[PDB]
Amino acid sequence: RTLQAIGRQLKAMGCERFDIGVRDATTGQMMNREWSAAEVLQNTPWLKRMNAQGNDVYIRPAEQERHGLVLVDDLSEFDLDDMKAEGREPALVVETSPKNYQAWVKVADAAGGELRGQIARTLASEYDADPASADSRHYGRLAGFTNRKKHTTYQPWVLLRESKGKTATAGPALVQQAGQQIEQAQRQQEKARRLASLERRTALDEYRSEMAGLVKRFGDDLSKCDFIAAQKLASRGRSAEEIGKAMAEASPALAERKHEADYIERTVSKVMGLPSVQLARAELARAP
């Protein structure tokens, strides 16, 4: 029955190539192989050996396979009833343990990773399924093997329950919805872009940023502006030299001097003597 189940599952999935995952439930050890459907069947003896030795057997379409299959994990029989009645008909259903199911939903003949991942999250949300399982590259279980990851008197079998292989009624609609949601996100991105436009950063950039706000409220005391900006830069770990050089280049109060060097030195000296600056710097020194 193992061979027959694998054969039906591969046909229902419909891919040319698959990733097969083999994981030791006790130890943690992992192997991944990429195989044609013919090669998966050719390797059934080895997979059964590995399963008997305590390994779970997993399956997904290969990377850069062109497909529209989306995995939905941790479903009840009632969840599947709802899915079917809403046009999210499974292309196949796998029982992973008693009363616990996975479905693969075919939304298109081909859909990129971007759309599939969005749909996976959408379907997991729609049916309150496992969100951690919702991504374009998540492994499902391969039918025909024992679940090694237990009942009283014994380890449950992974069973292929249905395997129609047909595109869901809502497939084209789910592809449209995903595209609309991505387009919406992109509009908000453009909004945030345009907003920042109206409103890589060195000591100089840091100084100018602080000043632009300080001169609006303290426009009659540009040296005070310097003092507050210097205090902020010094509290954030900037050097006395970094701050001096920034003032030398960009300070309006400095441009009035001459002398220049003395004003900078005194500004930096006063700032470095402040308990606030000393404590902030000491607390910074304890960070990586």
Side-chain angles (χ1 to χ4, degrees), residues 2-62 65 67-149 155-199 202-256 261 263-285 287-288:
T2 292
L3 223 32
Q4 292 71 25
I6 292 164
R8 290 176 183 180
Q9 180 166 347
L10 305 177
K11 179 187 158 174
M13 287 177 82
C15 319
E16 297 289 350
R17 299 188 75 83
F18 299 89
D19 294 325
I20 295 295
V22 171
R23 185 181 185 90
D24 192 300
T26 308
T27 262
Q29 182 178 358
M30 186 85 198
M31 297 174 197
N32 311 86
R33 316 302 305 169
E34 187 193 298
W35 288 329
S36 63
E39 295 170 333
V40 180
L41 289 166
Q42 197 185 358
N43 279 283
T44 298
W46 182 65
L47 297 174
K48 293 153 108 95
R49 171 173 182 85
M50 291 295 98
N51 188 223
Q53 293 179 340
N55 293 273
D56 291 287
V57 187
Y58 299 93
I59 188 176
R60 64 184 179 199
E65 171 80 22
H67 70 96
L69 249 44
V70 175
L71 180 68
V72 194
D73 198 19
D74 203 31
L75 296 162
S76 75
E77 62 167 272
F78 305 96
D79 292 334
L80 290 161
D81 293 330
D82 288 353
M83 292 180 67
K84 290 176 184 184
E86 293 167 13
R88 282 72 162 154
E89 302 92 337
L92 56 144
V93 177
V94 167
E95 189 163 18
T96 56
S97 58
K99 315 258 178 177
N100 293 307
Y101 306 92
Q102 282 176 349
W104 293 89
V105 178
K106 182 176 177 174
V107 297
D109 294 336
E114 159 182 358
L115 293 161
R116 284 189 282 106
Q118 184 78 20
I119 295 164
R121 293 190 297 276
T122 291
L123 291 173
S125 183
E126 276 179 12
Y127 304 105
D128 197 14
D130 195 337
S133 292
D135 70 85
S136 63
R137 292 283 283 149
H138 201 84
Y139 266 123
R141 294 293 201 123
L142 181 70
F145 299 98
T146 53
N147 188 319
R148 290 285 172 190
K149 210 173 173 179
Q155 210 64 34
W157 283 88
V158 181
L159 305 167
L160 188 68
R161 291 312 206 186
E162 67 175 86
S163 61
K164 287 169 180 183
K166 287 194 74 216
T167 302
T169 302
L174 288 158
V175 173
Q176 287 173 257
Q177 177 181 53
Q180 288 291 97
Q181 290 169 338
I182 294 161
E183 288 182 330
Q184 172 84 247
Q186 289 180 316
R187 287 194 298 276
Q188 296 307 308
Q189 181 182 12
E190 176 67 10
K191 174 200 183 165
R193 181 190 162 265
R194 287 179 182 212
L195 198 55
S197 183
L198 303 165
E199 287 158 307
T202 188
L204 185 65
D205 306 324
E206 205 171 319
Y207 169 82
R208 296 158 78 91
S209 200
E210 298 300 322
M211 291 294 285
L214 281 164
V215 304
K216 294 191 170 193
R217 59 197 194 277
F218 300 124
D220 56 357
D221 200 337
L222 293 167
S223 62
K224 178 185 178 71
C225 290
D226 276 355
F227 179 88
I228 299 175
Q231 183 199 1
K232 277 152 161 61
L233 267 61
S235 285
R236 292 161 200 176
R238 293 296 186 181
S239 153
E241 187 186 17
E242 277 180 304
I243 295 162
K245 166 154 187 162
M247 285 178 65
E249 191 72 33
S251 171
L254 176 96
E256 286 188 287
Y263 166 69
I264 295 166
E265 156 82 56
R266 187 155 43 76
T267 294
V268 178
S269 187
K270 284 206 301 190
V271 155
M272 293 306 183
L274 292 170
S276 62
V277 173
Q278 284 177 0
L279 183 58
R281 286 172 85 78
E283 292 179 357
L284 272 177

